Amino acid sequence: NLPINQVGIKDLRFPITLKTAEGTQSTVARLTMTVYLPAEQKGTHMSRFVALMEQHTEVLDFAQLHRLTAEMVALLDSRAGKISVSFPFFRKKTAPVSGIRSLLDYDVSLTGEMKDGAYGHSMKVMIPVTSLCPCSKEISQYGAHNQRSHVTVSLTSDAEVGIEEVIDYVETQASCQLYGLLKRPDEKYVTEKAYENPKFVEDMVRDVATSLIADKRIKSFVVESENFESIHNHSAYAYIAYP
Amino acid sequence: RNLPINQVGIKDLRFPITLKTAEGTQSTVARLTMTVYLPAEQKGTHMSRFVALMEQHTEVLDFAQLHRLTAEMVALLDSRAGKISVSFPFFRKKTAPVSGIRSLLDYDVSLTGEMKDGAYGHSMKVMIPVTSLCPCSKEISQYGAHNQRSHVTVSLTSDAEVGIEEVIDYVETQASCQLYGLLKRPDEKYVTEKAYENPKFVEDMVRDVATSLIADKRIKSFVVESENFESIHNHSAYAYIAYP
Amino acid sequence: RNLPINQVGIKDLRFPITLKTAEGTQSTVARLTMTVYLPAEQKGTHMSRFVALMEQHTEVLDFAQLHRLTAEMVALLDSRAGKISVSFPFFRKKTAPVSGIRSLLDYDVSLTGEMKDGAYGHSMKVMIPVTSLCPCSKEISQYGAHNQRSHVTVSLTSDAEVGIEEVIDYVETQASCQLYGLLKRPDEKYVTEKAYENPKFVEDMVRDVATSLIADKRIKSFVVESENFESIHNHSAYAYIAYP
Amino acid sequence: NLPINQVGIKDLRFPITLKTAEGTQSTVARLTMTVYLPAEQKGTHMSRFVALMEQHTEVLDFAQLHRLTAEMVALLDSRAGKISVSFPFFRKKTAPVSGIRSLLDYDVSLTGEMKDGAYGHSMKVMIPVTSLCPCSKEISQYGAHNQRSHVTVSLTSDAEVGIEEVIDYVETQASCQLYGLLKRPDEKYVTEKAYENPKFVEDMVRDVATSLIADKRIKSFVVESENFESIHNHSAYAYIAYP
Ligand SMILES: [Cl-]
Ligand SMILES: [Cl-]
Ligand SMILES: [Li+]
Ligand SMILES: [Li+]
Ligand SMILES: [Mn+2]
Ligand SMILES: [Mn+2]
Ligand SMILES: [Mn+2]
Ligand SMILES: [Mn+2]
C-alpha cells in the first residue's frame, strides 16, 4: 500500500493580514497545506484545505498558525499535517544620517506542523544586505568590490522568535544593511561604513550563527549567505547548520 | 570561537557540459554549486580554484567523472570534504505511440557528488513531466475528465550508479500518459484515450513510483513528489513520499 | 553630444498597496517601475525622489490616483515626461457553479500611467488563468479530451477607464471553462462537462476575446495572447492578436 | 472572423549547435515559432513546427535562421511568420593581469521574420558588467558602492551584426567587465579600474547608444541597463530607443 508523508495543495496564493511585535500589516501569501495519508486510504479531501482558508478571517500570528494547523488535521481527519505560509514582509527603517523613514522588504516563510497532537513551528527569513570584500580592499590602492547579498536564516524554536528579531540579528552583522531611501549624507555614511566593515561570506555566516547560538529559544538553524559578486557572474555562497 | 562552515564556495556558475549516459552522449548547459568544508581555524577558502577546476577539465561528465571531479576538488581546495552539484536540462529521443515519428523530450536533472574524509557518496534528482488525469472527474461526469500537465520529481541516493533514463522509465511507466513533443492525429487519439482509461490521483502516482523505487536494491533513500497543475483550479494538488 | 534618455529611474521596488476598484477595496503587494525622461543636457535624475513619492503617498490606488501620482512624479523629479508601472496580484470573490460556495481567485495585473508634456495616458495588462479544452482531441477520440490550464493575457490602452474585473469578465465569458479555488463534487461535475461541451483552440480563444475588445469603444489599442500549457506536450500552444 | 498576427508554439526547449565568428558551440535553446493565420482559417498545424526542428540537423547561424524561417512559412502554408531562439552563449575571456582564460555566459535571443517573401532579423543580448557609483565615490572619503549590472541590447540590422560585436560594444563601456576566473593581481586590477571609471546608469546607456549609432549596419535599437544597487533592495534602470 504505502503511507504518504504529506498530501494536499501547493502554492495557493491568498491575501493575509499579519500581526507581529511591531505591528499589523496586510500582505499576499503562497500556502502549501498537507496532511499525512494512511497506507490503505486512497485520497485526501482537497477542497477542505481551501475551505479552511476561506473560513478563517483571523489575523495571522504564531498563535493563529498553531490554531489553523490544529483545525486542519482535525478537519481532514488525519494524524499529522503541515501548513507553510510564504510572503513578502515590510519593516519601516530610519536612514542613518537624515533619519528619513522608508520600508524595506524581506521574504518570510512560517511553517506549522502537527504530529499526533504535538505541535512544532519553524520559520525562514531572507534578509538582503550589503557585502564588501576584505581581500579587494586590502590589495587595492583604492576601492573595494561590494554587492547585494541574500542572507537566509531558517530556524526552529519552542518559544516564539519574532521575524524582526531575526532581521536584527542579520542586519547587525552585515558590512552594511539596506534602505530604500537614502539622501546624499546617508549614501556617504553607508559607503564608508561598508568599507570600514568588509566581510567575506565566511565571516558573515559565522557572525550570524554565533548570534543565533546565543539565543537559547533556538533549537536548530541554518544560516546561508549568497553574495552576488559584483566582479563575477556567479555567487559566493556558504552555510552553517546547527546542531 | 571560530566555527567550522559546513559548505563554502561558489553557486550558480553556468557552464557548458557534455554528458555520457547509457543511451549516448549529449551537449547541455549546467548550473554548478561547488563547495568544501571549512574548519574552525581557517579564515576562508580559495574561490577562484572552483572555477579553475571546471576550466581545466575537459572530460565528458558521467558517474565516474563526477566522482573524480569531486575528489580532485577537495584536493585542489586543500579540504577534507565537499560537494559538487550540477543541474541541467536533459534530452531523450522519444517515439510517438501510433505513427512512430520521433522527437526529443526535455527533463530537468541534478547530479550531486560528495566527499567526506575520503568516502564518496552521490545522489540525483530528476523532474519528469507527465500527463495526469483525474479519476474523480471521469467517475462523476457523464463525459470527459479534467487533466493537466504534472511534474513528478524523484530524488534518490544510491550506493551503485542508477541511470538517468532508468528514473525516467520508472516514472513514465506509471503515468496516466507520458508526453511527446511531436504527435500526429492518430497519436493524439491514442494519448487522449490512454490518459482517459488510466486516471490517477497525485496519491496514486507517488505510490506507484515509490513501489518501484523501494524494490530497486541500489536505492538507499528517496523522495518522490508529484505536482498536478489542476486544470480546474489555480493551485496544485501535491504529494510526496520519503523513504525510509 | 549627449543624448536624451527615454526613461530613467527605479525598477522593481516592492511596495504594499491598497487598491480600489468597482467591486471593493483590497490590500496587495506591488512591484513598481518609476521613470522620467532625461533631456540631453542633464547628467542624471534624482533617484531617491521616486521612493520619497511612494513613502509620502498614503491614498488608495485607483485610476484617478494613478494619474495624480504620475503627475506628481514628473513635477517632483523636475521633468517633462515619465511613467509609473505598478504590477500586483489581484483577487476576486468567485462563486461555485453548483454549490454556490465562495472562494477567491488570483489574477496578475499591471497598471501604467504615463505623462508626456502634460498629456496623460494609461494602459493595463491582466493575466486571467482559464481552463482550455482541445476540440481536435474530443473530435478524434471515442472518449475524453485533453485539457490544461491556460494563461490569457490582455494588454490594452484606453481613453476612458476600463475596470480590471471588466477585462476579467470579457475573458472568462469566453473560456471553455473558468477556474475556482474551491469546488464541491457537483461543481467539479459541472466544470468537467462545461469544458467538454465548449472545446476551444488557442486560436478560438484569442478571436472570441478580440471581438469583445474591438467592440468596446473605450479601447484604442490592445493585444490578446493566450498560452495553452498543452497537457500532452512539454511546450505551449500560443497565439496573439494585436489591434489595430 | 479576425486574422491572428501570430500562432504556433512557445518555449519549446531544444538543443542547438551555434556557429558565430569566433567559433562553434553547443547550447540549449527555447524556441517560439509562429505563423500568420488568415481571417477565415480555423487553426494552424501545430505538429509541423516541431517536425521542422527535428528534421534540421544544421548548425545555427544567421544564414540558417533565414532558411529555417523560409521553410517554416512554406511548410505551414502561411504568408508570414517568426522564429525566435533564446539561449545562453559562452565566450572565452582572458583575465587582465594573469591572462588566465575562462568562460563567461551571456543571454542571447535571435529572431527571424518572413512577411510576404521578405525576410527581417533582429537580436537581443544581455551582458552582465560591473557598475560603480560616481556620486558614492565623490562624497565618500574612501570606497564607492558598486554592483552587478545587466545591460540588454536589442537591435535590428540588414547586414549581420555578430553576438560578440554587441558584447564588445558593451564591455568596452562598462566601469569594469566580468570574468569567472580572477587571480589576486586580477582582482586588484578590476577593483581599481572600476573605481577609476565610475558610471551612472545614465552614463552607461548613453555610452553604449553612441557606439551603436556609429555602427551603420544598425537600423534600430534599444539599450537598457539595470543596476542591482548594492545599497538598496531595488534597481536603478534606464533605456534609450533609437530612432
Ligand atoms: Cl524565505
Ligand atoms: Cl536576452
Ligand atoms: Li541552542
Ligand atoms: Li543607424
Ligand atoms: Mn573579492
Ligand atoms: Mn479532479
Ligand atoms: Mn490537442
Ligand atoms: Mn549611488
Side-chain angles (χ1 to χ4, degrees), chain B residues 41 49 143 148 150 192 196 203:
Chain B
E41 71 169 348
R49 295 181 188 188
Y143 37 59
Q148 54 279 319
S150 81
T192 295
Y196 195 76
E203 290 98 336

PDB file of all heavy atoms in Angstrom, chain B residues 41 49 143 148 150 192 196 203:
ATOM      1  N   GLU B  41      39.473  26.772  12.270  1.00  0.00           N
ATOM      2  CA  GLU B  41      40.671  27.615  12.336  1.00  0.00           C
ATOM      3  C   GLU B  41      41.039  28.370  11.071  1.00  0.00           C
ATOM      4  O   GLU B  41      41.920  29.248  11.110  1.00  0.00           O
ATOM      5  CB  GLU B  41      41.898  26.908  12.978  1.00  0.00           C
ATOM      6  CG  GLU B  41      42.604  25.789  12.175  1.00  0.00           C
ATOM      7  CD  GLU B  41      43.982  25.363  12.818  1.00  0.00           C
ATOM      8  OE1 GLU B  41      44.500  26.079  13.737  1.00  0.00           O
ATOM      9  OE2 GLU B  41      44.557  24.317  12.399  1.00  0.00           O
ATOM     10  N   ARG B  49      39.607  28.736  -7.379  1.00  0.00           N
ATOM     11  CA  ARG B  49      40.075  27.372  -7.673  1.00  0.00           C
ATOM     12  C   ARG B  49      38.909  26.499  -8.100  1.00  0.00           C
ATOM     13  O   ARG B  49      39.099  25.513  -8.798  1.00  0.00           O
ATOM     14  CB  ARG B  49      40.768  26.745  -6.438  1.00  0.00           C
ATOM     15  CG  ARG B  49      42.069  27.425  -5.983  1.00  0.00           C
ATOM     16  CD  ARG B  49      42.682  26.689  -4.765  1.00  0.00           C
ATOM     17  NE  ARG B  49      43.828  27.428  -4.196  1.00  0.00           N
ATOM     18  CZ  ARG B  49      44.644  26.955  -3.248  1.00  0.00           C
ATOM     19  NH1 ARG B  49      44.448  25.733  -2.758  1.00  0.00           N
ATOM     20  NH2 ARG B  49      45.663  27.698  -2.795  1.00  0.00           N
ATOM     21  N   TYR B 143     -19.513  12.679 -19.309  1.00  0.00           N
ATOM     22  CA  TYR B 143     -18.469  12.655 -20.337  1.00  0.00           C
ATOM     23  C   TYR B 143     -17.262  13.515 -19.896  1.00  0.00           C
ATOM     24  O   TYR B 143     -17.410  14.451 -19.083  1.00  0.00           O
ATOM     25  CB  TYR B 143     -19.013  13.065 -21.729  1.00  0.00           C
ATOM     26  CG  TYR B 143     -20.069  14.179 -21.736  1.00  0.00           C
ATOM     27  CD1 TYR B 143     -19.785  15.460 -21.212  1.00  0.00           C
ATOM     28  CD2 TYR B 143     -21.349  13.958 -22.275  1.00  0.00           C
ATOM     29  CE1 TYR B 143     -20.752  16.491 -21.205  1.00  0.00           C
ATOM     30  CE2 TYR B 143     -22.330  14.993 -22.280  1.00  0.00           C
ATOM     31  CZ  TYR B 143     -22.013  16.254 -21.740  1.00  0.00           C
ATOM     32  OH  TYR B 143     -22.937  17.278 -21.747  1.00  0.00           O
ATOM     33  N   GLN B 148      -4.236  17.553 -16.894  1.00  0.00           N
ATOM     34  CA  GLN B 148      -3.255  18.632 -16.830  1.00  0.00           C
ATOM     35  C   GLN B 148      -1.849  18.051 -16.828  1.00  0.00           C
ATOM     36  O   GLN B 148      -1.639  16.856 -16.513  1.00  0.00           O
ATOM     37  CB  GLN B 148      -3.452  19.470 -15.558  1.00  0.00           C
ATOM     38  CG  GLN B 148      -3.442  18.640 -14.260  1.00  0.00           C
ATOM     39  CD  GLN B 148      -4.776  17.973 -13.978  1.00  0.00           C
ATOM     40  OE1 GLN B 148      -5.840  18.588 -14.183  1.00  0.00           O
ATOM     41  NE2 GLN B 148      -4.739  16.714 -13.512  1.00  0.00           N
ATOM     42  N   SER B 150       1.691  17.498 -15.192  1.00  0.00           N
ATOM     43  CA  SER B 150       2.161  17.364 -13.843  1.00  0.00           C
ATOM     44  C   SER B 150       3.649  17.048 -13.828  1.00  0.00           C
ATOM     45  O   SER B 150       4.166  16.395 -14.729  1.00  0.00           O
ATOM     46  CB  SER B 150       1.285  16.360 -13.068  1.00  0.00           C
ATOM     47  OG  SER B 150       1.651  15.041 -13.343  1.00  0.00           O
ATOM     48  N   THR B 192      -4.993  10.626 -25.885  1.00  0.00           N
ATOM     49  CA  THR B 192      -6.245  11.054 -25.249  1.00  0.00           C
ATOM     50  C   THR B 192      -6.931   9.899 -24.504  1.00  0.00           C
ATOM     51  O   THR B 192      -7.376  10.063 -23.348  1.00  0.00           O
ATOM     52  CB  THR B 192      -7.233  11.711 -26.266  1.00  0.00           C
ATOM     53  OG1 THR B 192      -6.660  12.927 -26.775  1.00  0.00           O
ATOM     54  CG2 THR B 192      -8.562  12.051 -25.597  1.00  0.00           C
ATOM     55  N   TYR B 196      -7.392   8.824 -20.461  1.00  0.00           N
ATOM     56  CA  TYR B 196      -8.801   8.591 -20.011  1.00  0.00           C
ATOM     57  C   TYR B 196      -8.978   7.230 -19.295  1.00  0.00           C
ATOM     58  O   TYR B 196      -9.595   7.158 -18.204  1.00  0.00           O
ATOM     59  CB  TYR B 196      -9.784   8.721 -21.196  1.00  0.00           C
ATOM     60  CG  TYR B 196     -11.275   8.855 -20.849  1.00  0.00           C
ATOM     61  CD1 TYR B 196     -11.805  10.072 -20.371  1.00  0.00           C
ATOM     62  CD2 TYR B 196     -12.167   7.775 -21.045  1.00  0.00           C
ATOM     63  CE1 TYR B 196     -13.184  10.200 -20.082  1.00  0.00           C
ATOM     64  CE2 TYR B 196     -13.533   7.893 -20.752  1.00  0.00           C
ATOM     65  CZ  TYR B 196     -14.031   9.109 -20.273  1.00  0.00           C
ATOM     66  OH  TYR B 196     -15.372   9.238 -19.997  1.00  0.00           O
ATOM     67  N   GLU B 203      -1.918  11.059  -5.397  1.00  0.00           N
ATOM     68  CA  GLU B 203      -1.669   9.999  -4.404  1.00  0.00           C
ATOM     69  C   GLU B 203      -1.241   8.668  -5.069  1.00  0.00           C
ATOM     70  O   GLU B 203      -0.256   8.060  -4.684  1.00  0.00           O
ATOM     71  CB  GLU B 203      -2.916   9.754  -3.555  1.00  0.00           C
ATOM     72  CG  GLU B 203      -3.279  10.885  -2.579  1.00  0.00           C
ATOM     73  CD  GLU B 203      -4.361  11.813  -3.118  1.00  0.00           C
ATOM     74  OE1 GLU B 203      -4.479  11.859  -4.348  1.00  0.00           O
ATOM     75  OE2 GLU B 203      -5.069  12.515  -2.327  1.00  0.00           O
TER      76      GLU B 203
END
